[PDB]
Amino acid sequence: GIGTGFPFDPHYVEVLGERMHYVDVGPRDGTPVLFLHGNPTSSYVWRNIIPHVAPTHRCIAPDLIGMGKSDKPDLGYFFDDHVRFMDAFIEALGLEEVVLVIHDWGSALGFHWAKRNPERVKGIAFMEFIRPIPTWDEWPEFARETFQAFRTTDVGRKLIIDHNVFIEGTLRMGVVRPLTEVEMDHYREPFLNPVDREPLWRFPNELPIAGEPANIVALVEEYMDWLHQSPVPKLLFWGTPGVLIPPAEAARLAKSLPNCKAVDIGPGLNLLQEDNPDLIGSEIARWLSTLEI
Ligand SMILES: [Cl-]
């Protein structure tokens, strides 16, 4: 079955006075492949994808600040905080040119960094990514009232912080197949202490839905405008029914975006990595072999 282990040796780097953890496997030479997770996951989400890429390419998978095995300072964990820490993580590792593999909030980080530093990005593989959601009617009906409740300081914090609903409920409702207890324990581990759950609540409050928050909408629009014109090689994975993007819009987008290959992974919600890791990993590896890297 789908692997549950996390066999990767820990690596740590000091970033803005805090320690960040990252996976680092594969050959030391060549262009590195930088894997960026989202909410409420960690590098654990890439555990079954990396082994398809690591034979031929260096794979770097950081835990976002406040998440995974990274340090957990008392921040607001706004998108801007993650931008500051990820910018500094990339420089602290001395990365020059990279290929990005990105998901959920990791995709906002990756696309925003790529738009600002396009000379350093040699390809982008992406899935279930942050885009403007024009109205609440484009958010999946089965999850709509809860995400609306998440975006409050009263009910939303009670659910996400006090009761850990993003881990115990939303995560599982983001995967089609059932998650095992061992997998759930890996996802629970960074957030056993309720005071460490701020990122889990701030992230859904940053989602660009129905024009709010205006600053995130503007930033995401800017990187989507870039992506619609840039020649950067692109690989889009999508599933049915999806969460952040529905199938027809995914297929339409992959046709519209320059130099973009699309892969239908079959059934999927948000964490496509948990529903078809072998296809995602094998297709990333095949696509990498076509790039000038
Ligand atoms: Cl979120």
Author numbering: 3 to 295
The article reads:
Self-labeling protein tags such as HaloTag are powerful tools that can label fusion proteins with synthetic fluorophores for use in fluorescence microscopy. Here we introduce HaloTag variants with either increased or decreased brightness and fluorescence lifetime compared with HaloTag7 when labeled with rhodamines.
HaloTag9 increased the fluorescence intensity of 16 fluorophores, including rhodamines based on the popular SiR, carbopyronine (CPY) and TMR scaffolds. On the other hand, the mechanisms behind the increase in fluorescence lifetime observed for HaloTag9 are more complex, involving factors such as changes in electrostatic surface potential or the positioning of the fluorophore on the protein surface. Hence, HaloTag9 showed the longest and HaloTag10 the shortest fluorescence lifetime. All except one fluorophore showed notably higher brightness when bound to HaloTag9 instead of HaloTag7. Photostability measurements showed that the higher the fluorescence lifetime, the more photobleaching occurred, making HaloTag9 the least and HaloTag10 and HaloTag11 the most photostable tags. However, the difference in photostability between HaloTag7 and HaloTag9 is rather small and HaloTag9 is still suitable for stimulated emission depletion (STED) microscopy, which relies on high irradiation intensities. The increased brightness of HaloTag9 relative to HaloTag7 makes it an attractive tool for applications such as fluorescence correlation spectroscopy (FCS) measurements and fluorescence confocal microscopy.
